[PDB]
């Protein structure tokens, strides 16, 4: 119940934290996927499709980190926590 967020505040932080144990885990859970998406874009020209690209269809020039956060909020990824 609120106005639609605009900017780097979308998706809302509370919904993201509802999935991850804590924000310290969420930052890594997002950054590693951003790195994966960036690597996929880098190897888009030619290479083995070992790193699957973005799951949710990206927008017009959306940064990889934003795509990672959106696809995390959409409940399409699963992560395992070390120790």
């Amino acid at each position: 119940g609120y106005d639609t967020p605009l900017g780097i505040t979308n998706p809302p932080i509370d919904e993201l934290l509802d999935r991850v144990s804590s924000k310290y885990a969420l930052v890594i859970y997002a950054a590693k996927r951003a790195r994966q998406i960036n690597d996929y874009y880098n190897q888009l020209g030619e290479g083995i499709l070992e790193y699957v690209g973005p799951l949710v269809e990206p927008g017009l020039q959306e940064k990889p980190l934003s795509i990672a956060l959106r696809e995390i909020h959409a409940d399409l990824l699963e992560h395992t926590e070390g120790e």
Binding site: V52, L55, L76, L77
Partner: peptide, 9 residues
Amino acid sequence: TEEARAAAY
């Protein structure tokens, strides 16, 4: 997740 990969393409 495996479902997302299966439905990706």
